[PDB]
Write a protein that binds this ligand. Structure first.
Ligand SMILES: *[C@@H]1O[C@H](CO)[C@@H](O[C@@H]2O[C@H](CO)[C@@H](O[C@@H]3O[C@H](CO)[C@@H](O)[C@H](O[C@H]4O[C@H](CO)[C@@H](O)[C@H](O)[C@@H]4O)[C@@H]3O)[C@H](O)[C@H]2NC(C)=O)[C@H](O)[C@H]1NC(C)=O
Ligand SMILES: *[C@@H]1O[C@H](CO)[C@@H](O[C@@H]2O[C@H](CO)[C@@H](O[C@@H]3O[C@H](CO)[C@@H](O)[C@H](O[C@H]4O[C@H](CO)[C@@H](O)[C@H](O)[C@@H]4O)[C@@H]3O)[C@H](O)[C@H]2NC(C)=O)[C@H](O)[C@H]1NC(C)=O
Ligand SMILES: *[C@@H]1O[C@H](CO)[C@@H](O[C@@H]2O[C@H](CO)[C@@H](O)[C@H](O)[C@H]2NC(C)=O)[C@H](O)[C@H]1NC(C)=O
Ligand SMILES: *[C@@H]1O[C@H](CO)[C@@H](O[C@@H]2O[C@H](CO)[C@@H](O)[C@H](O)[C@H]2NC(C)=O)[C@H](O)[C@H]1NC(C)=O
Ligand SMILES: *[C@@H]1O[C@H](CO)[C@@H](O[C@@H]2O[C@H](CO)[C@@H](O)[C@H](O)[C@H]2NC(C)=O)[C@H](O)[C@H]1NC(C)=O
Ligand SMILES: *[C@@H]1O[C@H](CO)[C@@H](O[C@@H]2O[C@H](CO)[C@@H](O)[C@H](O)[C@H]2NC(C)=O)[C@H](O)[C@H]1NC(C)=O
Ligand SMILES: *[C@@H]1O[C@H](CO)[C@@H](O[C@@H]2O[C@H](CO)[C@@H](O)[C@H](O)[C@H]2NC(C)=O)[C@H](O)[C@H]1NC(C)=O
Ligand SMILES: *[C@@H]1O[C@H](CO)[C@@H](O[C@@H]2O[C@H](CO)[C@@H](O)[C@H](O)[C@H]2NC(C)=O)[C@H](O)[C@H]1NC(C)=O
Ligand SMILES: N[C@@H](CCP(=O)(O)C[C@@H](CCC(=O)O)C(=O)O)C(=O)O
Ligand SMILES: N[C@@H](CCP(=O)(O)C[C@@H](CCC(=O)O)C(=O)O)C(=O)O
Ligand SMILES: *[C@@H]1O[C@H](CO)[C@@H](O)[C@H](O)[C@H]1NC(C)=O
Ligand SMILES: *[C@@H]1O[C@H](CO)[C@@H](O)[C@H](O)[C@H]1NC(C)=O
Ligand SMILES: *[C@@H]1O[C@H](CO)[C@@H](O)[C@H](O)[C@H]1NC(C)=O
Ligand SMILES: *[C@@H]1O[C@H](CO)[C@@H](O)[C@H](O)[C@H]1NC(C)=O
Ligand SMILES: *[C@@H]1O[C@H](CO)[C@@H](O)[C@H](O)[C@H]1NC(C)=O
Ligand SMILES: *[C@@H]1O[C@H](CO)[C@@H](O)[C@H](O)[C@H]1NC(C)=O
Ligand SMILES: [Ca+2]
Ligand SMILES: [Ca+2]
Ligand SMILES: [Cl-]
Ligand SMILES: [Cl-]
Ligand SMILES: [Zn+2]
Ligand SMILES: [Zn+2]
Ligand SMILES: [Zn+2]
Ligand SMILES: [Zn+2]
Lengths: 694, 694
């Protein structure tokens, strides 16, 4: 038979291993020839695997690269302008790669050029609360200082935005062993820890969903009108550069001024972690000097788009997408995901060659320039937004399949909770000690839901990956799953070798998943999700799961407001409309579920499938969120303090955030009230899409 | 049988006459008790007629009314502050109505309060080109002057906006006999001309599609957050008041300063039509003083929404809507349309009682507060936008059925051209001298297309009626039809008794349509359109008609640009992308038409019906037009100089308008280029919705 089991059984760990090896022998940096060649290879193989059509969709977008003949570095400079210490010009290459060409040296993509010199201030993780502590409690002023911050906890672009608004004239990012060196494990190549010479590349944009900085709202095609660089979206105004902890130690060890306010500011280096500004007495006339010479350049990028036409509903799209571009070799990010997608295409193609077609159309994507701000997925979605708006069922992301080997990690819309629970109950656990047990059983045991007994944790969607345009801008039901570590507070920090030259095929094969059983398990979850979405007669969404979370989020935002009871009294701030809307949604969704079960009629079915498909669509506000026109979902948005984290009722959340510090409380509370109205209205409007249609 | 003929034959002139009489015995001003009572009557009758459900949808919106105990008027004031002449406090009531209560005196709705005194400047129709002539050619400065303008040619709100930006401190609108008194016809009550004491009420907002001034983007429901009046949308900043031509004559006769620049500035009054500023030597110390005391007040309004559930596609909506609120009796505007809607509901209900149901759902609407800025339709559409976005097939408007008795006047999307041509060929002409000939034949003869032989004129959609939110904001295929006059250059001016107390049932019965044959003909066109849209198996839209007009519009906008060849050379301004897109649209639409003809499969049918329904949707840009976020259609928008007129490629048009006067030509031409890109992209994207789906 041609059923989900046939599909799943065709998937092979061995094939995933072969493809991972194949995708990770050379770097595949966006906008380079090596990545175009890999695009063409994938396009060819997907055709061979049996897809109906496979095309490259290209765009010309703003990318950023170091100057090959004028390298970036940081110095300590003495009284006389002698550079007495220089940071490294490249990461020592790993064994057997010391002759590989075209390894991009560590840099912060989209940094402006500059050579600022000044005194250092240490800002911990450069989070909003870190800057509050500095400025409000410690009375330290960052204006005209070079800030140094440890990577971790939040997206690096948020750190740079926070530094810029504190008046910093430059930012130095570094990897502290506290966040990037697990106790009792060896440095690469002998284990999975970050060596002192290792450095994390990554972009530092604040795009808020815009895509290519030069063409917000429209695809960066051949005739596109581009903004001038001065009007570009999201570019940092101060130079930024990343370094390893050997180099960081040299910059931190001399630091003077104030002591760290408490232990949560101290990393693992043998230094005081003094905040500054500047160095201790003896070195007080030494400064830090950055040298940044990178250039932003409009460059062609290439997405691969494969189509497997649906047999019954060809005009309904289920999309499996993930990126292909890497900083260097991409042994985990993204090739552990790309290899999984490749094996899923192969398996679907095997069924198709035997005469099977899915019910709905399945689109497969290999996105480009993900590392430079989700550029490829965003531009494609801008080009095809009308088709996606009216036909998009669901989007399943497929970046890194592993970031650990401990348990499953799933983030998705509530609409997919039941699908995930059901599928994971049908799949075998790969975990030691859970042999013959379901994936659902190991996951729930290792990652328990904070709200429910005998249920697994499923997290919210924010941004920092290619689902963002589909979910936050267009309102298409989205999900993602991967294997992860135990390390709770390291959730948003990355595994240790993240975005370093050490992230190789050998890293994965030796230390992460020698048998490729975790990869296989993730291929089963991602592929099985796509299978059910593309093939189930009734779409596998349960609107009642949205009703349950909406109540939890309404309780939560109410509880935040209720920290300010006097203001709620003064300004008559009521959440009654929001709770009414959530109650209504719960009642209507219950009735709709009854009809979905109680309803041979393909019109009533598709009518009902359309109500299910457009339910996520209904949470979109066409006016967008305040000053973030491309984040249009009213229930979720990327956190304004951390792009990686999803925030619920973001418009009300941001209206409430730090509100006790606002100069005009009347105005600030009026805005909270406006956001409550928008939220209550959108919840009610979404509810009403599930009512009987006439 | 139950077919279109059964429906059409059930419609009766006699019934339309009875309903018109019934709706026009007392005023039905929005937000008054008399209009709420009429709402409830209609709700009752629609239920009795057989509709499945009929509900009132209420909102609380900003309305405007004179102060009953502090009347509005204008004076000529002498040196000593004696008011030597006062304009009228009310229009002399017509025969037999001289004891009717609750006739609102003439006023300009949403005028601010004030008592400005100053010198007059006469500004012709206060159009953009009139102000150009004054300021640029005649060097007359309106700053701190009271402007007097004749009604006609453009929407009155455009006149007020133009006056405000010329620095006027007040505006006096009047009805000139040149525009409102047809040669050889008697004044009301003895003919259809405007008496010297008659005055045209009307709102003077510049809402640009926002709806209720206080709640742009969201329905004005019970819990709505409202903007403060100072942040309200579209309110005029200077007092405004309308007067008749007896009063106007008194204000104009003393005018001095410069002579009218030419004859197109001279009306029909026995006065010089001097521009001013101020009065001739003898009266040079006399001033004009306005006294405006009207108040803006949040007030409840009521839409009636009737549903006739579809038998096969209940989740597809065809909407027939028109307003119920009038300035006074509304004998033409809107009751000649409302009576037609009432008879259409009755006829559909007769079929339904005999067991028939249309294929798709038909929604019938009696909108409130249309006269105060399309408030009722807009608020309802804001509340239901998700349902309309995903389910709305078409909207047919139904305001005044007659504004003359000469021929048909149709404005609609190109998608409906074929439907209208076909339907009008099947209907009998009501015209004298065309007995036994088709409506198509009389219409084409009397209103020939400027572009095609043996085709009738069909005009573009702008705004100034309740289709605006559906078409310009939401992108739902819209149309309208009515009977009209010959008077070409009076197209946007109104028939003479427009918005005056003289617009009565007797006006219509005696002078316009004694036999109600023109009303019947319009009921047949509107009802027949609804019938075909709600019942045809394949939606009756022809995408090839859009391809033809897109080429005409692209030729037109190119021709405007080509007045500036040196600039197009300097700035490399190419329309090639736009023509490419139009060519592509033409090719794809041709192929889609072939498939639509070449395709027993209900999925392929509905897939194809969905491609037809979402085609109008595809011309929507979610970012809207520049500084007009609620006008989102890229091919059409209300003219920025005249809300009543549709403009094609409005974004490029406005970028080009008066461009030779821009201070930074580089910037101005860069914007033209940006708009060409947006237009080319949107045309191509719309084209691609008609491609094979996978
Ligand atoms: C959740 O669903 C329910 C429907 O089950 C929905 O209930 C509706 O609530 C509105 C707003 O409260 C009700 O509005 C009232 O409507 C009546 C006419 O039906 C009016 O007369 C009321 O106005 C008077 O009273 C107000 C309150 O004191 C005054 O401010 C006002 O000046 C008037 O005196 C009022 O508009 C509506 O009737 C119900 N509909 C029902 C029960 O069918 C509720 O709104 C939904 N929640 C959300 C957030 O949408
Ligand atoms: C109307 O429909 C047609 C499809 O029939 C569509 O044609 C497409 O036009 C684009 C833009 O011109 C073509 O883009 C080219 O794509 C090739 C790869 O296929 C590139 O190598 C080209 O780039 C080179 O040449 C450029 C021009 O000199 C240079 O600027 C650039 O630096 C490169 O050297 C270029 O991107 C595309 O191939 C066709 N597609 C076809 C024929 O299938 C057209 O765009 C549609 N109209 C609109 C307005 O969308
Ligand atoms: C990755 O696998 C691909 C596909 O097997 C390899 O590309 C093929 O290599 C052979 C030998 O050079 C060529 O003849 C084919 O034309 C290629 N096929 C393609 C591109 O579809 C490629 O060599 C592998 N890369 C690595 C590093 O192992
Ligand atoms: C850090 O690098 C800088 C730049 O290469 C070195 O300073 C340069 O040294 C050369 C050779 O002595 C001089 O000719 C240049 O004028 C210097 N350029 C400067 C100051 O920018 C410096 O020696 C290096 N420092 C260390 C400790 O290795
Ligand atoms: C997850 O699986 C459960 C258990 O099978 C599904 O819930 C059942 O659905 C069937 C089929 O309609 C109903 O008749 C049962 O009453 C349901 N059992 C329950 C609610 O416990 C559920 O639909 C699946 N979820 C999906 C497919 O999204
Ligand atoms: C307009 O027609 C309506 C409906 O025929 C009339 O309202 C009815 O009048 C009778 C007599 O007063 C009442 O008993 C009914 O309850 C009314 N029916 C309704 C409101 O549905 C109304 O009188 C007519 N108005 C005029 C001016 O002729
Ligand atoms: C125009 O109307 C004004 C206002 O009613 C008249 O002026 C008022 O006249 C009364 C009675 O003489 C005075 O007591 C008021 O003080 C006047 N109020 C003003 C100047 O605002 C005026 O007489 C009328 N003019 C004409 C020509 O009828
Ligand atoms: C308007 O009527 C014309 C003439 O009947 C329709 O065009 C015909 O449609 C039929 C039915 O599919 C085709 O087989 C003919 O070839 C068409 N004749 C032509 C193009 O001259 C047209 O479809 C109608 N338009 C509507 C219903 O929107
Ligand atoms: N761990 C994260 C990051 C994966 P990523 O591919 O590395 C994304 C990349 C760009 C994100 C952006 O620009 O928004 C970055 O975070 O630097 C995840 O799994 O989702
Ligand atoms: N002749 C016009 C006007 C009919 P209307 O009902 O009178 C509309 C009303 C308000 C329009 C607005 O606010 O946008 C007005 O123009 O004053 C037509 O038929 O379409
Ligand atoms: C790279 O290095 C030097 C620095 O000016 C110069 O030769 C060249 O312009 C640079 N390339 C750039 C800026 O892209
Ligand atoms: C921070 O330092 C700069 C130094 O010139 C100054 O302009 C700024 O106002 C300072 N802010 C505070 C609050 O200390
Ligand atoms: C894989 O799992 C084993 C067993 O707990 C563990 O010791 C090892 O650290 C894991 N590998 C990684 C990279 O987490
Ligand atoms: C109407 O007339 C007078 C003018 O002030 C006053 O008695 C009353 O306030 C006015 N009503 C208003 C302003 O609504
Ligand atoms: C128009 O008149 C006012 C009078 O003060 C003045 O401010 C304004 O600049 C004048 N404009 C021109 C161009 O005459
Ligand atoms: C109706 O038509 C007749 C015949 O042309 C004409 O004389 C009369 O003016 C028309 N009525 C109106 C109101 O236009
Ligand atoms: Ca773009
Ligand atoms: Ca509103
Ligand atoms: Cl992922
Ligand atoms: Cl109309
Ligand atoms: Zn990635
Ligand atoms: Zn990455
Ligand atoms: Zn009207
Ligand atoms: Zn009107």
């Amino acid at each position: 038979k041609h059923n989900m089991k046939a599909f799943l059984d065709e998937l092979k760990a061995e094939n995933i291993k072969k493809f991972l090896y194949n995708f990770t022998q050379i770097p595949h940096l966006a906008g380079t020839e090596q990545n175009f060649q890999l695009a063409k290879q994938i396009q060819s193989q997907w055709k061979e695997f049996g897809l109906d059509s496979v095309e490259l969709a290209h765009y010309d977008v703003l990318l950023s690269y170091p100057n090959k003949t004028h390298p970036n570095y940081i110095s300590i400079i003495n009284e006389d302008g002698n550079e007495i210490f220089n940071t490294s010009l490249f990461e020592p290459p790993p064994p057997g790669y010391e002759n590989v060409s075209d390894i991009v040296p560590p840099f912060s993509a989209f940094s402006p050029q500059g050579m600022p010199e000044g005194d250092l201030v240490y800002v911990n993780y450069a989070r909003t609360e870190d800057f509050f502590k500095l400025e409000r409690d410690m009375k330290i002023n960052c204006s005209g200082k070079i800030v140094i911050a440890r990577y971790g906890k939040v997206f690096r672009g948020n750190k740079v935005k926070n530094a810029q608004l504190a008046g910093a004239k430059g930012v130095i990012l570094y990897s502290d062993p506290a966040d990037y060196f697990a106790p009792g494990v060896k440095s690469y190549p002998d284990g999975w820890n970050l060596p002192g010479g290792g450095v994390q590349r990554g972009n530092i944009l604040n795009l808020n969903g815009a895509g290519d900085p030069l063409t917000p709202g429209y695809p960066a095609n051949e005739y596109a009108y581009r903004r001038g660089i001065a009007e570009a979206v999201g570019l940092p105004s101060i130079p930024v550069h990343p370094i390893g902890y050997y180099d960081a130690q040299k910059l931190l060890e001399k630091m003077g001024g104030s002591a760290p306010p408490d232990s949560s500011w101290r990393g693992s280096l043998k230094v005081p972690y003094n905040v500054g500004p500047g160095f201790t007495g003896n070195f007080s006339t030494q400064k830090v000097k950055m040298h940044i010479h990178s250039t932003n350049e409009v460059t062609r990028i290439y997405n691969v788009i494969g189509t497997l036409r649906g047999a019954v509903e060809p005009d309904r799209y289920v999309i499996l997408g993930g990126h292909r571009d890497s900083w260097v070799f991409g042994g985990i990010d993204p090739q552990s995901g790309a290899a999984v997608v490749h094996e899923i295409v192969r398996s679907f193609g095997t069924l198709k060659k035997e005469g099977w077609r899915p019910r709905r159309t399945i689109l497969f994507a290999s996105w480009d320039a993900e590392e430079f701000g989700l550029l490829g997925s965003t531009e494609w979605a801008e080009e095809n937004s009308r088709l996606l708006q009216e036909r998009g069922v669901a989007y399943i992301n497929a970046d890194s399949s592993i970031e650990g080997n401990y348990t499953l990690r799933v983030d998705c819309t509530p609409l997919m909770y039941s699908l995930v629970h059901n599928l994971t109950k049908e799949l075998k656990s790969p975990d030691e000690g859970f042999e013959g047990k379901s994936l659902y059983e190991s996951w729930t045991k290792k990652s328990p839901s904070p709200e429910f007994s005998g249920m697994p944790r499923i997290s919210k969607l924010g941004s920092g990956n290619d689902f963002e345009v589909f979910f936050q801008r267009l309102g298409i039901a989205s999900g993602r799953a991967r294997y992860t570590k135990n390390w709770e507070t390291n959730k948003f920090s990355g595994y240790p070798l993240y975005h370093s030259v050490y992230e190789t095929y050998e890293l994965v094969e030796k230390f992460y998943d020698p048998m490729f059983k975790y990869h296989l398990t993730v291929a089963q979850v991602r592929g099985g999700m796509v299978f059910e979405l593309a093939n189930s007669i009734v779409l596998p969404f349960d609107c009642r799961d949205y009703a349950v979370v909406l109540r939890k989020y309404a309780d939560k935002i109410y509880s935040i407001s209720m920290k300010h009871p006097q203001e709620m009294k003064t300004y008559s701030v009521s959440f009654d409309s929001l709770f009414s809307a959530v109650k209504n949604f719960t009642e209507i969704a219950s009735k709709f579920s009854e009809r979905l079960q109680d309803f041979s009629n393909p019109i009533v079915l598709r009518m009902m499938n359309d109500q299910l498909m457009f339910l996520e669509r209904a949470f979109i506000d066409p006016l967008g969120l305040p000053d973030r026109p491309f984040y249009r979902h009213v229930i979720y948005a990327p956190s304004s303090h951390n792009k990686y984290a999803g925030e619920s009722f973001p418009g009300i959340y941001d209206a409430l955030f730090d509100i006790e510090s606002k100069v005009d409380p009347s105005k600030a509370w009026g805005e909270v009230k406006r956001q409550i109205y928008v939220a209550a209205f959108t919840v009610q409007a979404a509810a009403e899409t599930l009512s009987e249609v006439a």
